[PDB]
């Protein structure tokens, strides 16, 4: 029952990896390919984060894998800290 869903997820992941390999071959040799439209739109766009661009979609997110993003910086976070109370 769940094995069919697991196999579907595995096949989708394999196809996504194939598209990523096609994108690598594109970056090496060109190229008009699958993820070209997303990257072309994102480069000219003002969206510094991929979350607001792809809206959480999986194929859009993995089409942009390997590129720089604002989310990659951990130093920009600021953990809220409560100072010592008293003596």
């Amino acid at each position: 029952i769940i094995i069919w869903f697991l196999l579907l997820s595995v096949c989708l992941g394999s196809l996504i990896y194939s598209t990523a390999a096609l994108g690598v071959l594109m970056s090496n040799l060109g190229m008009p390919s699958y993820c070209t439209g997303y990257r072309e739109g994102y480069l000219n766009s003002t969206n510094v984060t991929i979350a607001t661009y792809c809206t959480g979609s999986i194929p859009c997110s993995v089409c942009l894998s390997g590129l720089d993003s604002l989310d990659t910086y951990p130093s920009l976070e600021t953990i809220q800290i409560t100072i010592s109370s008293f003596k």
Binding site: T78, I79, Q80, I81, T82, I83, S84, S85, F86, K87
Partner: protein, 50 residues
């Protein structure tokens, strides 16, 4: 952030019996009035009083 009446090199602030918080740091303070000779952050507690 507490209410202020003078800003610059010298500051005067007023506080209430509630915790005040700023960017990344929340602190507890009591009601009163504080005067500082410098523009450093000031709150009413023993740590800043020392």
């Amino acid at each position: 952030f507490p209410n202020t009446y003078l800003e610059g090199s010298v500051r005067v602030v007023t506080t209430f019996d509630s915790e005040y918080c700023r960017h990344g740091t929340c602190e507890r303070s009591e009601a009163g009035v504080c005067v500082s000779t410098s523009g450093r952050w000031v709150l009413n507690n023993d740590y800043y009083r020392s």
